[PDB]
Predict the structure.
Amino acid sequence: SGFRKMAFPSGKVEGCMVQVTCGTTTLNGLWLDDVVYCPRHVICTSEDMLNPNYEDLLIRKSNHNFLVQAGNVQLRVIGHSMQNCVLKLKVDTANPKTPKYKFVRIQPGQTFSVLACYNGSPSGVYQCAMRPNFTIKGSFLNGSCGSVGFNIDYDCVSFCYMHHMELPTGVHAGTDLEGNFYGPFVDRQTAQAAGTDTTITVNVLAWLYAAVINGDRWFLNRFTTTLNDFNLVAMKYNYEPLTQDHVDILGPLSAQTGIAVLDMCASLKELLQNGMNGRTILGSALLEDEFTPFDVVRQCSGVTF
Amino acid sequence: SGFRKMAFPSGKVEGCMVQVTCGTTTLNGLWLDDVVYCPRHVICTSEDMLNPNYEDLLIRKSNHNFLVQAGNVQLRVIGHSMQNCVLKLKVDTANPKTPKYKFVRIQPGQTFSVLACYNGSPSGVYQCAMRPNFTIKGSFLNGSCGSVGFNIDYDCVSFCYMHHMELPTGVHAGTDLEGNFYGPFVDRQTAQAAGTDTTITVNVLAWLYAAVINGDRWFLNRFTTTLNDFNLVAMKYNYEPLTQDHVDILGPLSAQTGIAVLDMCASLKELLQNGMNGRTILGSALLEDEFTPFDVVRQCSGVTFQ
Ligand SMILES: *[C@H](O)[C@H](C[C@@H]1CCNC1=O)NC(=O)[C@@H]1[C@@H]2[C@H](CN1C(=O)C1(c3ccccc3)CC1)C2(C)C
Ligand SMILES: *[C@H](O)[C@H](C[C@@H]1CCNC1=O)NC(=O)[C@@H]1[C@@H]2[C@H](CN1C(=O)C1(c3ccccc3)CC1)C2(C)C
């Protein structure tokens, strides 16, 4: 028993992290096969970041403008190209530690592990969620760019995130590994704002199921609700609509505990309307939304990678 | 910016995890050099489990009663010995993935990452603290025994915890890598319970400093306190005593923010009196106690967002 915010084991990804230097600008890259991937803003000076023309900037570089370093070893760059907001540097050496991998794009509400790196060296691992507004609430300092986010599935590393920027509010934005941003953001140092965030309702219900599985049961009332009446209350608290697909996804946890989804929704309704009243669920005085249904099932069953 | 509960990268420990089987019992072991370390209760029957004599159980074993598996590979066990509550199986092969390592024993309040394993295979990684009562609030199902806890300092893995048992409240107990328990607990199914836990005060103060470094000041006040009047109030909420040694290690964070430790103590006294009042600090509606001063220094910027 017990329930922790848990990341995937990071070993497979640690042996893909490299340092990428272009001029004064230095960040991380991901080395897979014979290609190193990193944010395209590596080619910018600090003055260029204010209004970059990435076509013109990259045309004015060639291979010898890029220093890639794996440990002590320099990898020699032999080609360069840009796909969306990521730079692809081709190197002469294939990474011998390349895992089985996929590049995947995730949805809002889905979770992933971040391996935070500085100078090509992994420093920390943490779990987070893609917010409804397409940000992540991460922990990232200067130099963290090129740190990746991942899930593991059946030995395959599914890479889903590459870090690019921090927004004024202190939340983070980045791309998938094919360079497409999550969210209405651009890789330019200019004023940007994420929109109003919302709570991921299906994940709250999942974590309430995790609480029941671990013995926290005080919030379970004898009331019930329709899905419609639930969504009408939940919408007033900035919670996402719960769809029937979400109800279906909570199916397994509902079957495991014996608590119907809509009865857990009636429990959540009363927690929103009345409060916690000084009590805690799983060690928290607020409702947690960064565990998916599948994370609950995985952690409360012992699945290995 | 930002603030996360953050574990260490786990890859160096992942290359040391093995499965150890003895009879019908299966758990994890840690393979460092030519030794595999595991909990000694791998040798117990289900009958003796209240009152095992481990010396008597272990003398009845040969090396070939211990099946050790490293991935695909069976490691042949070629010696065995017991040190306290850990069993040390010598194997014929030194692990080529062995990191730089130490074995350390930690205090209450200090933090470590846990790599939770089943069958020799890692499931996940999380960060936790040694509680004042010598338990940890972990996430551990049956089969997780032999999962280890660690910190990494400059590519050296300091191993500090090996998991042995769950106590009735759902908290967890275990040993250092020399096999001595943290706390009064024993590897017996006799009735055991943890003592009343307390909040790690120095860690709360550190996390309030982290909140200032990331730009929140709402909970500060105009007041100061003596250390003794601080502890007299703090004890009434179940907080651990703050010592002068604790005040010293908060030094760097005090210097960075400009807020004297005893003025941050005054803020904490008012937070405990008043509550949060609908607000949050660093994403939480309670005062968090599993970030040390060193965790804050490591994770935060050196520039306060003023
Ligand atoms: C890459 O290492 C870095 C990581 C940021 C800096 C602090 N925390 C982080 O996560 N990325 C950038 O510096 C990124 C580059 C330039 C600005 N930028 C930011 O994250 C800014 C910023 C400022 C104003 C508006 C939007 C973003 C500096 C914080 C660009 C987007 C090209
Ligand atoms: C080893 O894999 C296992 C891990 C426990 C089980 C559930 N969660 C865990 O962390 N350890 C044990 O089973 C351990 C062994 C036997 C009892 N025990 C426990 O953790 C118990 C227990 C029962 C009564 C008193 C104290 C502890 C089953 C929960 C021993 C201590 C030898």
